[PDB]
Design a protein around this ligand. Structure first.
Ligand code: R9E
Ligand code: CL
Lengths: 299, 305
């Protein structure tokens, strides 16, 4: 019993964190094999190819623990800088670089000066921002998921927006969202609630003995989406319905029956009650996170 | 900016998790140097759990009855002893991944990270607090026994909890790493229940200071209170009494934000009376009590917004 916001064990990622210094700027890098990946703004209207050509290998100071790494080459891929080093990381795990979709969750290992300080779970919001916990020096901290023994790197931290939310790239340097890496007027778009995730979280509450919000009613997908659009909820697709299939069979509550419960909660509120110790509808647990936490899958 | 429930990086702890099997029971152990620490109920049957005589059960076991597995490698048990509710298995190999560590017994209100394991394999990490009734609200399934709670101070791992059992309400009970239970619980299948729980007042205050540091002041008021009057009001909402120690502990946060501790107590009194009125504090519609004053100072900035 119990339902917590749970992150993946961070050990395989901790062994990859390094400190990267260039001039006055100091941030974090990801050391995999003989390459260190970090945000290209470490070299900072910035013409990045023009600023990079002026730099030489010895301008980049890389520190792995108490050991200095020797930079032997450098290249840029989109908004990521790739520093070729002399030593291959002996702690390199089996890994992939993956691009996630909004609504998908991941673990963040927050670092300062190449040293990991914390791990937390979060989701890629529909507006492509993440609600993280980051201070100055956190740039280069990474987002990941673990699938069996393979680490899938999905996010690298680049910046904080004026509302306190965060923006970054995949490990190939492509930003999530209509953001750019530079000091300019940038704002997050209007956010929405991840509907498939709230439904998964309602199924997790049923599994844990919270059935007060269930009713005898069902709905149509069309009628549910007309109601969900009024509350700034993401549209629910037939793919989302198919994805919730296992949870529906386990609890005996069909997705459109649970949708009628969500509809009543949106129009009436909680009435002094909580669901899994929360007075808000939680949208940062995917259907796979619910199944994984309510089955005990190990890494 | 931002405020998340943050756990410590788990790597130093992952390298200590092993699987311990005795007969039909399989649970987790903590391998530090040449000793594996695990709950003593690993020697029990489900029948035995009603009134186990652990000393009588242990005297009948030999070293080779305990199967210890570290990854895909079998460890050889060369000795065994019991310390309170923990079994200590002497093994023939020292853990090369043993970090710098301490065994610490915490007090209610304290927070820590939990590395939940099944079959000696870590599956997840989460942050939680020792409740005033000595239970923890964890996320644990069958086979999680032996999972540990820890804090990482500088580069030293302070082990404070080992998971032993789930109570009928879904909450969890366990021991420190010396085998002493937190709370009036026993590692027995007798009728036990968690006492009525209360809110950790000093932690909610720390969390209100974290919201002020992050730029949110809507909940503040022009009033103050005496400590006695605050406690008379707090007791009516099932809040833990606030002591002079708690007031002293909140001193740094008070100096940083410019709000006196008893003035922050006055905002809390008003929040308890009025509710949130459709508003949130740090993305929460409830008053959060699982961030200590030390956690707030660690995660938040040194400059108030
Ligand atoms: C078999 O069902 C579960 C067991 C769990 C568990 N194990 C025990 O409670 C075993 C036990 C029994 C009686 C006294 C003691 Cl000391 C220990 C620990 N945590 C979570 C659990 C969740 C479960 F669903
Ligand atoms: Cl303590």
């Amino acid at each position: 019993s119990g339902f917590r916001k749970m992150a993946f064990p961070s050990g395989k990622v901790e062994g990859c964190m390094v400190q990267v210094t260039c001039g006055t700027t100091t941030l974090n890098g990801l050391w995999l094999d003989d390459v260190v990946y970090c945000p290209r703004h470490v070299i900072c209207n910035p013409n990045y190819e023009d600023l990079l050509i002026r730099k030489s290998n010895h301008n980049f100071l890389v520190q792995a623990g108490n050991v200095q790494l020797r930079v032997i080459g450098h290249s840029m891929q989109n908004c990521v800088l790739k520093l070729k080093v002399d030593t291959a990381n002996p702690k390199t795990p089996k890994y992939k670089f993956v691009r996630i979709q909004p609504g998908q969750t991941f673990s963040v290992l927050a670092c300062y000066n190449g040293s990991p300080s914390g791990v937390y779970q979060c989701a890629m919001r529909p507006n492509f921002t993440i609600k993280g916990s980051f201070l100055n020096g956190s740039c280069g901290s990474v987002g990941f998921n673990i699938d069996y023994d393979c680490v899938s790197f999905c996010y690298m931290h680049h910046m904080e927006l004026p509302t306190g939310v965060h923006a970054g790239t995949d490990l190939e340097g492509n930003f999530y969202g209509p953001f750019v890496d530079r000091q300019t007027a940038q704002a997050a778009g209007t956010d929405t609630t991840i509907t498939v995730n709230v439904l998964a979280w309602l199924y997790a509450a049923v599994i844990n003995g919270d059935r007060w919000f269930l009713n005898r009613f069902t709905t149509t997908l069309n009628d549910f989406n007309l109601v969900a659009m009024k509350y700034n909820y993401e549209p629910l697709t037939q793919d989302h319905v198919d994805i919730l299939g296992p949870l529906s069979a386990q609890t005996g509550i069909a997705v459109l029956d649970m949708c009628a419960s969500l509809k009543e909660l949106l129009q009436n509120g909680m009435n002094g009650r909580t669901i899994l110790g929360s007075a808000l509808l939680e949208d940062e647990f995917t259907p796979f996170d619910v199944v994984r936490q309510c089955s005990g899958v190990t890494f």
